[PDB]
Amino acid sequence: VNSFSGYLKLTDNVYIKNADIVEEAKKVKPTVVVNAANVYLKHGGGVAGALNKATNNAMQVESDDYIATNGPLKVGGSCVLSGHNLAKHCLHVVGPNVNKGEDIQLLKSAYENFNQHEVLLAPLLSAGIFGADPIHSLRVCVDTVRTNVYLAVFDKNLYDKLVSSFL
Ligand SMILES: O=C(c1ccccc1)c1ccc(CSc2ncnc3[nH]cnc23)cc1
């Protein structure tokens, strides 16, 4: 039993809700919140900009030190950093950005990072400003993630379309 509330169950292990991931993180304080990161951990907009804003820029400060030490992530890769006031940990996961020309096949590799964590609160990878089809992202999530994932979808219209079209 966990504290996630109001989710629709899609499969044995995947759950979905129309919710602001920032507000959901602040309420649940999950062990792991997933950020829709880029390789530079520059949290300017989309989910990343919103999560970072909620940390009063502490996420960005921590991230800049991480990059200075380790260099950029790989597309499809991830790193674990602090969750600040939102979660115990933040799993920064880089899905391919279609608006940059990145291989959409890397979306499966990106979701594989979730399997290193038993339970996660997450957005749909590569959705939103990353330019991929969210219906496809949900399909890859369900077919790749085996751990327990709670998906927060900000847009109500998109949430309804994802549920109604789910196979
Ligand atoms: O401006 C703030 C703010 C943050 C901290 C403190 C005060 C104000 C803001 C802005 C946007 C959002 C929406 S989060 C989101 N965006 C995009 N895609 C998603 N998929 C799931 N969730 C999302 C929430 C808060």
Tab-separated table of C-alpha atoms and ligand atoms in Angstrom:
chain	number	residue	atom	x	y	z
A	1	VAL	CA	0.000	0.000	0.000
A	2	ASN	CA	1.257	3.474	-0.959
A	3	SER	CA	-0.011	7.049	-0.661
A	4	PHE	CA	-0.828	7.715	-4.332
A	5	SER	CA	-4.511	8.650	-4.653
A	6	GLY	CA	-6.999	9.073	-7.473
A	7	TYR	CA	-5.069	7.153	-10.132
A	8	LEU	CA	-6.625	5.047	-12.860
A	9	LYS	CA	-4.980	1.621	-13.117
A	10	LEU	CA	-3.817	0.814	-16.656
A	11	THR	CA	-1.895	-2.425	-16.037
A	12	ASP	CA	-0.483	-4.498	-13.199
A	13	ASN	CA	2.164	-1.829	-12.561
A	14	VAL	CA	1.216	1.419	-14.388
A	15	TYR	CA	-1.183	4.040	-13.011
A	16	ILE	CA	-2.221	7.426	-14.442
A	17	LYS	CA	-3.780	10.676	-13.230
A	18	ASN	CA	-4.596	14.155	-14.527
A	19	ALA	CA	-2.338	16.078	-12.171
A	20	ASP	CA	0.379	18.698	-11.920
A	21	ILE	CA	3.493	16.657	-11.117
A	22	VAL	CA	4.778	19.537	-8.966
A	23	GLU	CA	1.654	19.583	-6.800
A	24	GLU	CA	1.530	15.790	-6.770
A	25	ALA	CA	5.151	15.615	-5.616
A	26	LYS	CA	4.562	18.216	-2.901
A	27	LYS	CA	1.566	16.240	-1.602
A	28	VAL	CA	2.936	12.690	-1.785
A	29	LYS	CA	6.657	13.323	-1.161
A	30	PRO	CA	7.471	10.159	-3.138
A	31	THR	CA	10.738	8.305	-2.826
A	32	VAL	CA	11.456	9.128	-6.487
A	33	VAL	CA	10.133	11.870	-8.752
A	34	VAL	CA	11.228	11.664	-12.389
A	35	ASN	CA	12.357	14.813	-14.172
A	36	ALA	CA	12.064	15.226	-17.944
A	37	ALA	CA	15.706	16.276	-18.192
A	38	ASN	CA	18.044	17.186	-21.018
A	39	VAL	CA	21.682	16.083	-21.224
A	40	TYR	CA	22.925	19.383	-19.762
A	41	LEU	CA	20.459	19.325	-16.845
A	42	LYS	CA	19.366	22.820	-17.899
A	43	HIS	CA	15.906	22.945	-16.353
A	44	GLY	CA	14.430	25.773	-18.368
A	45	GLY	CA	10.886	24.784	-19.243
A	46	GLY	CA	8.351	22.021	-19.436
A	47	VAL	CA	8.331	19.617	-16.509
A	48	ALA	CA	11.969	20.400	-15.691
A	49	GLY	CA	11.423	24.146	-15.499
A	50	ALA	CA	8.395	23.619	-13.270
A	51	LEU	CA	10.135	21.163	-10.919
A	52	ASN	CA	13.186	23.394	-10.657
A	53	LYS	CA	11.063	26.489	-9.968
A	54	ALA	CA	9.342	24.590	-7.144
A	55	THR	CA	12.783	23.968	-5.561
A	56	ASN	CA	13.600	27.706	-5.660
A	57	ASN	CA	16.402	26.900	-8.195
A	58	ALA	CA	18.170	24.493	-5.801
A	59	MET	CA	17.718	21.710	-8.360
A	60	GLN	CA	19.569	23.814	-10.948
A	61	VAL	CA	22.405	24.670	-8.540
A	62	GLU	CA	22.887	20.986	-7.686
A	63	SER	CA	22.652	20.041	-11.370
A	64	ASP	CA	25.292	22.562	-12.447
A	65	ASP	CA	27.730	21.059	-9.945
A	66	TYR	CA	26.866	17.562	-11.213
A	67	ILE	CA	27.599	18.543	-14.833
A	68	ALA	CA	30.803	20.378	-13.916
A	69	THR	CA	32.064	17.156	-12.313
A	70	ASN	CA	30.651	14.482	-14.620
A	71	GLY	CA	29.848	16.063	-17.973
A	72	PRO	CA	26.561	15.682	-19.837
A	73	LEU	CA	24.253	12.715	-19.633
A	74	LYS	CA	23.503	10.496	-22.623
A	75	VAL	CA	20.186	10.692	-24.438
A	76	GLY	CA	18.384	7.694	-22.967
A	77	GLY	CA	20.385	7.974	-19.740
A	78	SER	CA	19.741	9.223	-16.239
A	79	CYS	CA	21.234	10.279	-12.951
A	80	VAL	CA	19.918	10.271	-9.383
A	81	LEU	CA	20.098	13.593	-7.546
A	82	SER	CA	18.299	15.111	-4.580
A	83	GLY	CA	14.540	15.480	-4.633
A	84	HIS	CA	14.860	18.694	-2.590
A	85	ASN	CA	11.455	19.677	-1.126
A	86	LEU	CA	9.560	17.519	-3.642
A	87	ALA	CA	10.736	13.928	-3.071
A	88	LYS	CA	13.554	11.986	-1.469
A	89	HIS	CA	15.301	11.615	-4.841
A	90	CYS	CA	14.921	13.024	-8.329
A	91	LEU	CA	15.672	10.647	-11.197
A	92	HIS	CA	16.675	12.932	-14.077
A	93	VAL	CA	15.874	10.956	-17.243
A	94	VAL	CA	16.723	12.159	-20.753
A	95	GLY	CA	14.173	11.102	-23.320
A	96	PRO	CA	14.881	11.915	-26.962
A	97	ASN	CA	13.816	15.429	-27.991
A	98	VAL	CA	12.117	15.148	-31.381
A	99	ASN	CA	12.517	18.899	-31.879
A	100	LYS	CA	16.293	18.223	-31.822
A	101	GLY	CA	16.231	15.304	-34.281
A	102	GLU	CA	16.955	12.580	-31.721
A	103	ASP	CA	16.198	8.914	-32.377
A	104	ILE	CA	12.774	8.025	-30.993
A	105	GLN	CA	13.982	4.444	-30.477
A	106	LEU	CA	15.940	5.882	-27.539
A	107	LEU	CA	12.627	6.310	-25.704
A	108	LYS	CA	12.679	2.659	-24.612
A	109	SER	CA	16.215	3.048	-23.243
A	110	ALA	CA	15.053	6.136	-21.329
A	111	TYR	CA	12.175	4.245	-19.704
A	112	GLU	CA	14.498	1.359	-18.742
A	113	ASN	CA	16.002	3.688	-16.123
A	114	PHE	CA	12.704	3.489	-14.218
A	115	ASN	CA	13.284	-0.234	-13.557
A	116	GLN	CA	16.061	0.630	-11.088
A	117	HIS	CA	13.423	2.045	-8.696
A	118	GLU	CA	10.571	0.116	-7.116
A	119	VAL	CA	8.070	3.023	-7.189
A	120	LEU	CA	8.175	6.340	-9.082
A	121	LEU	CA	6.096	9.425	-9.784
A	122	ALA	CA	6.788	10.395	-13.383
A	123	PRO	CA	5.723	12.355	-16.450
A	124	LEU	CA	5.444	10.793	-19.879
A	125	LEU	CA	8.962	10.865	-21.296
A	126	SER	CA	9.563	12.829	-24.498
A	127	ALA	CA	6.034	14.320	-24.321
A	128	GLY	CA	5.238	18.021	-24.122
A	129	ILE	CA	8.017	20.257	-25.422
A	130	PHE	CA	10.150	17.197	-26.243
A	131	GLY	CA	7.892	16.710	-29.264
A	132	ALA	CA	6.989	13.008	-29.208
A	133	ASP	CA	3.485	11.559	-29.451
A	134	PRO	CA	2.298	11.055	-25.837
A	135	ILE	CA	0.175	8.059	-26.868
A	136	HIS	CA	3.364	6.403	-28.108
A	137	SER	CA	5.223	7.383	-24.940
A	138	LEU	CA	2.542	5.728	-22.806
A	139	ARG	CA	2.749	2.565	-24.921
A	140	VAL	CA	6.532	2.390	-24.508
A	141	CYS	CA	6.168	3.028	-20.775
A	142	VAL	CA	3.707	0.167	-20.317
A	143	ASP	CA	5.814	-2.188	-22.444
A	144	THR	CA	9.144	-1.286	-20.774
A	145	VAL	CA	8.648	-0.335	-17.123
A	146	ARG	CA	8.135	-3.286	-14.785
A	147	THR	CA	8.301	-1.368	-11.500
A	148	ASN	CA	5.366	0.624	-10.127
A	149	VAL	CA	4.961	3.901	-12.011
A	150	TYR	CA	2.454	6.664	-11.251
A	151	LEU	CA	2.114	8.916	-14.285
A	152	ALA	CA	1.041	12.535	-13.874
A	153	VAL	CA	-0.436	14.168	-16.975
A	154	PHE	CA	-0.849	17.933	-16.678
A	155	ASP	CA	-3.275	18.516	-19.546
A	156	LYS	CA	-6.805	17.264	-18.858
A	157	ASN	CA	-7.648	16.999	-22.551
A	158	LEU	CA	-4.529	14.903	-23.122
A	159	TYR	CA	-5.244	12.750	-20.069
A	160	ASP	CA	-8.708	11.882	-21.387
A	161	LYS	CA	-7.319	11.016	-24.826
A	162	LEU	CA	-4.628	8.771	-23.315
A	163	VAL	CA	-7.167	6.832	-21.250
A	164	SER	CA	-9.766	6.541	-23.999
A	165	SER	CA	-7.232	5.310	-26.571
A	166	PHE	CA	-5.341	2.932	-24.277
A	167	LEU	CA	-5.188	-0.651	-25.495
B	1	LIG	O1	4.895	28.282	-12.175
B	1	LIG	C1	4.859	27.225	-11.562
B	1	LIG	C2	5.326	27.272	-10.142
B	1	LIG	C3	6.201	26.298	-9.655
B	1	LIG	C4	6.628	26.345	-8.334
B	1	LIG	C5	6.197	27.347	-7.474
B	1	LIG	C6	5.322	28.313	-7.956
B	1	LIG	C7	4.888	28.272	-9.280
B	1	LIG	C8	4.330	26.041	-12.304
B	1	LIG	C9	4.301	25.989	-13.694
B	1	LIG	C10	3.795	24.871	-14.360
B	1	LIG	C11	3.292	23.767	-13.661
B	1	LIG	C12	2.755	22.571	-14.378
B	1	LIG	S1	3.820	21.055	-14.191
B	1	LIG	C13	3.914	20.256	-15.765
B	1	LIG	N1	4.297	20.960	-16.840
B	1	LIG	C14	4.361	20.316	-18.056
B	1	LIG	N2	4.080	19.029	-18.346
B	1	LIG	C15	3.688	18.334	-17.237
B	1	LIG	N3	3.319	16.996	-17.142
B	1	LIG	C16	3.001	16.764	-15.790
B	1	LIG	N4	3.147	17.877	-15.037
B	1	LIG	C17	3.583	18.882	-15.920
B	1	LIG	C18	3.328	23.833	-12.271
B	1	LIG	C19	3.833	24.944	-11.602
